[PDB]
């Protein structure tokens, strides 16, 4: 079973889901207007059965409260601070981190804050400097929604369908509709303004293994750009692409995604470590 509990943090009350796996811990960080509940396939499947999968809800998302201070919390760096505080409270310093989309950007910001991170996998995330946003992302009809505060019952359906892919479930509406819209607006403005660390430079200089896994039919991320990004230590020496998946391969193509994630976790935690 999945163990659910809530943490009182400086950012607000944070909802946390944990699998019962006895193995090394994996923090999974959800995307913009999503929730850790999206990682059901990993929490409840083979990944969560073996490893201790931790899937919280960001402030303003899911079953977490809105941020005590939106100006502090709703940014890639603010979320990274919140997740670092969560891991401190959970007593876990050496998790492997998986970040989906916004969660991948948060994971990149966590590299400086969480130095014993054993690896970072990013999916739906182009590491970009602020001036590279146009190169790293695909312009499109749903792109503006990322930073749009007010969602109607539509501009909730469109967002949910494009970000989560097949299969669509009504429960996805509940998740997206709950999101504190201020979090979209403030995060987006701050990212475009470079209030946090330059993500291009961070991943180029990072020594920990970074894995990059995307769906081939990504509607938001330019895969050609991603395949050209410099990483200090790119896992298996290339960026990886899963056929018949878009923005959310961990739910669209779970067995194939899990092959990458399991192999990455094993490599980052179960191999002899040298320098």
Residue numbers in the entry: 2 to 276
From the paper:
N-Acyl homoserine lactonases (AHL-lactonases) have important functions in decreasing pathogenicity by degrading AHLs. Unlike most AHL-lactonases, AidH is proposed to be a member of the α/β-hydrolase fold family. AidH contains a substrate-binding tunnel between the core domain and the cap domain. Taken together, the present results reveal the catalytic mechanism of the metal-independent AHL-lactonase, which is a typical acid–base covalent catalysis.
The crystal structure of AidH was determined at 1.29 Å resolution using single-wavelength anomalous dispersion (SAD) phasing. The crystal has the symmetry of space group P21 and contains two molecules per asymmetric unit. Size-exclusion chromatography and analytical ultracentrifugation data for AidH indicate that it is monomeric in solution. Therefore, the functional unit of the enzyme is a monomer and the dimeric organization on crystallization is likely to be an artifact of the crystal packing. The α/β-hydrolase fold core domain consists of an eight-stranded mostly parallel β-sheet (only the second β-strand, β2, is antiparallel to the rest) surrounded by seven α-­helices. The cap domain composed of five α-helices is inserted between strands β6 and α4 of the core domain. The whole active site is covered by the cap domain. (i) The structure of AidH shows that it possesses a conserved catalytic triad (Ser102, His248 and Glu219) and a recognizable substrate-binding tunnel. A hydrogen-bond network connects Ser102 to Glu219 via His248. No metal ion is bound in the active site, which is different from other AHL-lactonases, which have a dual Lewis acid catalysis mechanism.
